[model samples]
Target: WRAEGTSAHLRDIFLGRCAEYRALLSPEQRNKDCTAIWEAFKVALDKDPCSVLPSDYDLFITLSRHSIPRDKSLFWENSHLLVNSFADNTRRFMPLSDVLYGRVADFLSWCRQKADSGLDYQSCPTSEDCENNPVDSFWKRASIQYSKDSSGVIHVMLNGSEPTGAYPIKGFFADYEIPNLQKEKITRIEIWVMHEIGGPNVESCGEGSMKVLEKRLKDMGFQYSCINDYRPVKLLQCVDHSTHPDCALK
Candidate 1:
């Protein structure tokens, strides 16, 4: 499909989120240049959609960035929708999408070409079509920053049923975010191995690829903990499919 909308369309969402961010969190004077922030985002976009690089968003990130609260950063791989449902931001925890950069662009895709008004509104390349597409790179950029800023105790939500493994070798959490984490600030890395409502639980807290990840963290001098089907997230997952055997009183 084509890009979600034109630059004007995304601008509306970006500007709206900027205002909402200020109100929802604090009326801080730091982000007064909200319009310029949107412009910076566009600068990295007006190019070959496939040619966009993660660093292309560097300028946009600095202007749109907001600090994640300590102990609230929840990183996930292969499990975004469920993690979003679990991390309420205001109450439970804050995922990357809740932060300013990811919040404005969540579920929205946009790319541009050197054409009229810059946007390829008719059609845009997707991640499958190109390794470094615009939308994917933007999320990577935002996710990297979110990981870097994480401190205190942090969390990772993995899909226990992922056929490849709970922690995929090339996943964003394993590739980019894990290495960028601030070692001195992060007191502990908590892993939540969540499975689907049904069965086929391929992995868990201490099994599957998690063991490799655990060893990696240990070698890096990081202490960590693990759990299976974190209570809140499991309850949330069973909300609709509560009749599933896994959700039984057993």
Candidate 2:
């Protein structure tokens, strides 16, 4: 039978893919590197699905390390698809999502252990479930590491059109990643607040909750800059809506 999305299947698949990717590296290096990841994941395999906290993946994060190129670390809130596409197309920067484990499993997949024995391919935890669910914990761990490892210029893309404000104070970016950023290591943070093509222009730069975000960053002692309606990001928006009036102007 096809294991498909089962926890056991995903475990095997991730390990297998990891091995395949690390095939060229020294066998000793592979063993030394991946052992912690296997063990960390195994901790959640036989336990309550919602009890796995982000701290549980600490060892895995430490062992499974990927270096981020300086001045290329891109972060996004409410703009994942756009930011990722821009990074991939320009080839000028590397978002946290493009790194190793993030590249392999981020957002694209999920798995949770079954109540009886192995994984339950039929269902995974929903957003309303406890915050310690396997999928959330994994991203939490990865996000923390991504922020901690970044240096030099860091870029953040926030959605100005969001009704609740661009920088959500509780989500992964604000709660996990931002707290882990190394102040001394980072030289600057460029915040890009972009809105939809034909918009009422709800918020941007010094307006709305973006100002709060800017102030918070300043209070944290990070040198930063913010831009409203960034041209490149706007152009990317136009790519999907070519006939829009915004596209006509440029």
Candidate 3:
């Protein structure tokens, strides 16, 4: 059975296809290297080339909806699913690098069109209703990058809202990694200090926050690099009051 709207049905079908792909793969192939599984998926997709495009016009239309006061959870949850799905699928056929770059841009374009339409949703609908459903949330330009240097260290950076910077950045790395490449990506992260502070002592809070960020990154088998130099209003310099205050200026 299909959902009533184009977006809903499109989401369902895309997810369904993913499940089918997983189910149909041979047990051995399912556990094969990503490159191998990617090749196999391409061969299968070639058999039915028409399914590449998203078929739900209504879903595409519903994507135009936006939030009134800015719902972070709703916004990120929906966009994460959509963006990740696109990126993961594309990874099989395109260069892994392309998959990472293309998905972020694709996600932004999807949301940008909706934003331009001036759409808003006061409340989310139940699962049954087509227009009322809350699943129809706005997507944004959120960018993500995953890089592995010659030394086999991995680093991932995601730019968007705060939660996305914190959660999805780490989660995506965990979700997709070959065993050999595991603990390789996400070697460091660079974010603004305002990201963690809420009040008057934001600079002090920033210093402590960096420690927390550093710990968080290291715990995940990565390092932390404070690009506080780029932060505005001399926040980093104030925080480095005693030590090399010059460090913040440079």
Candidate 4:
């Protein structure tokens, strides 16, 4: 899907998915504003792919509102796949990714326009070049809105075995979501740290850089709690490795 393609095709994919999910949206969200989203998207199309900023998608974010249930909002870093899987199967939490984009396209997918004409499908931008990419900008805007709209108890699932640190200080969660969280609206923040089965434990709640995360929340005046090795996430891990020692059904 990397080769240069017609913008019409991309628009069709996005609009088609929007229509398919219209019934699931609220009256305000189902008012057919996707054309506005397309216009916001086009604002960065012809520009240098590396020059795009999150603000470029601001209108797109405003036009793409979806409701997040109280206490069911989940956020994650370095644990996207696992967290989404858990949310999908348990239906106990709705990750920000699920709330905004749904399952239409992979979150990491990207697109750009061809010099001659049309759009380029094969190549997108990487994390290093993300600030200038359309896909990345959309998520940045969406995440900010998600955090701003979230209320009550919100769950954050982090990888305990992350090489650098579980709660990165510079990623989207830190740069975009954390700052956007509504301190006055949110009641509590629950952080869950999960490590790989039989793998060396690197970080956990109240340990390593988690203390930094805690301090940030505390300074923000938000009530929060943390737990190491959250059971449900571990159980989900076992689904793919049933014979692992951690999956022995304690």
Candidate 5:
């Protein structure tokens, strides 16, 4: 059942199962199910007879060099499509996690660098007042994270956003134009919503959001778990340096 070129089709069949299983639920029910479906598909990308193998990530990275370019609108659109498509696929694997993590990390890193130079990622301009304004506002505070494991599990996290912002973010995953990726290498994905409220209520928001995310992941059929906590108000964990496969990126 391995066709290098047709791997994407097989992957789609797997993801389609997830979507079909998910479609039977209500909107609220389906939301988390969608996230869980992604998590599961990401995991299905690692078997020896995999429809697609680890090298698929390499191809994606290479193609992204110019085929996708780095324009804000286009980049986000592409990223969003990729995420969504992954949600629909349902193969299984571990290395696919590394691939997903690396690609997403690269995307976020690119966005941050562009922002540092005053270009901003896709929006949220880099105007004068924006510089002095505390980055705790609606538009000024959005970010992404990537995680990978020797076991081949990869985790990608997105958080700190207004409700209106989810569209473009999801669109970024949806518009990503990697054909082979639709159902090939990756197995499962879990999209997480992160919140960072300070003071004694920190646990309330962090744990609460995590609990919600966990339920969401389960509904989608994901089989992985990790703890995400919103940190202290004035002291946020900006970036992580450890190369531990399970390390959570900021």
Candidate 6:
């Protein structure tokens, strides 16, 4: 059976995420309306599920404007949850998912019907159905904006233990974020290829798949460096196993 569409649930979560975001807006930006934002988002998906284009979300994106905190933007691939734990919006980072639009749409799948002005709560087409499906298109559009807004020494936390390699050839980082990055405003692209505390060290720093990643960055004239087990995350991973030797103090 096909996966059911998160049509109604999607709307609920969108507003939920919006409320959370509104509460976090730094005082001066507190004046906001989630309903208007919701309407803008819904308009983008009111079409054939598999026919949606990334450009469809342009208006929704513009109306939800706010600048990413400079030097705090973080990118990630194959390490979504871990990246969120580290970022936590107000922690040390703020990845795209922490922003209003990204936060609203992340982890939800939805589609609309062309026959009527209603969402397909039955079965939305999956990404495998076609390239331009609702979920993929929104992310592509959001990622482009997130990358463009990133400045200063940006960070990307990749998964060293990923079977497909630290950087997926066809994933978000490879396609959208990396290529869209503003070179002139960035001093360096710091790379962190981390594995779990006790997990296999498949790739690290310039090892394994990271070499290709480094080469790509270098060719673009963006200074870059690689690290394994970035200390803070290491400590976090070790939290459940604080007694483990990896968590031992120096």
Candidate of highest TM-score: 6
In Å, residue 117's CA in model 1 sits off its true spot by: 4.8
What is the C-alpha lDDT profile of model 1 across 1-250, one tens digit per residue? 4345444577788888876766556556454467877888887577777788999989988887777788998888889898777877546888988887787787777887645447776666666778788888887888789989999998989889999889888778888898999999999999999888876799987786999989998898998899999988999988888788777766
Residues forming the 10-long window of minimal summed lDDT in candidate 5:
66-75
TM-scores for every candidate against the unseen true structure: 0.88, 0.82, 0.27, 0.84, 0.25, 0.92
lDDT of 4 by residue, 1-250 (tens): 2222323466678666666656656676667566675666666666655667878767666666667888888888999788778888226687875664533333435455535334566566655644466667667777888888888998999999998878898888889988998888788999999898886688878887899999998898888899887988888787888998778975
Candidate 4 lands at a TM-score of: 0.84
- What lDDT tens digits, residue by residue, belong to model 5 across residues 77-168? 11243333333322222112123222222222111122233322333212232321212111111111111111123344344343333223
Candidate 6 achieves a global lDDT of 0.83
Candidate 6: tens digits of C-alpha lDDT, residues 1-250 = 1556755677788888899888878778776678888898886567777788998889888877678887888899988888888887656788988987788987787887647677777776666767787878889999999999889989999999887789877888989988999998998889888887778777888876788889888998888888888888888778788788888888
Off by over 4 Å in 5: 1-151, 165-170, 177-184, 199-250
Q: For each candidate in the order shown, give its overall lDDT on alpha carbons.
A: 0.81, 0.74, 0.29, 0.73, 0.29, 0.83
| lDDT of model 5 at position 250 | 68
Please provide, for model 3 over 1-250, each residue's C-alpha lDDT reduced to its tens digit, 9 standing for 90 to 100. 1222223233334434444544434464443233332232222122221122222222322222121111101111112432343334533222122222122123221111122232122222323333222122211111111212112222222222243333342332333321223344333344333222232323322354345545655676655454432344234324535344343444
lDDT of 6 at 196: 75
Which stretches of candidate 6 lie above 4 Å from their native place? 1-4, 113-118
Model 2 C-alpha lDDT per residue in residues 101-218, reported as the tens digit of each score: 5654544445555456666676666557565677777788889889999999999998888888888878888888889999989999999998988875678788877777888899
Better of 4 and 6 by TM-score: 6
- Sort the predicted structures by TM-score, highest score first: 6, 1, 4, 2, 3, 5
> What's the true lDDT of residue 157 in model 5?
37
Best by lDDT: 6
Clashing pairs in 2: none
lDDT score, candidate 1, position 151: 96
Q: How does model 2 score by TM-score?
A: 0.82
User: How far off is residue 143 in model 4, in Å?
Assistant: 1.2
Clashing pairs in model 6? none
- Backbone clash pairs for candidate 1 read none
Tell me how many clashing residue pairs each candidate has: 0, 0, 12, 3, 43, 0
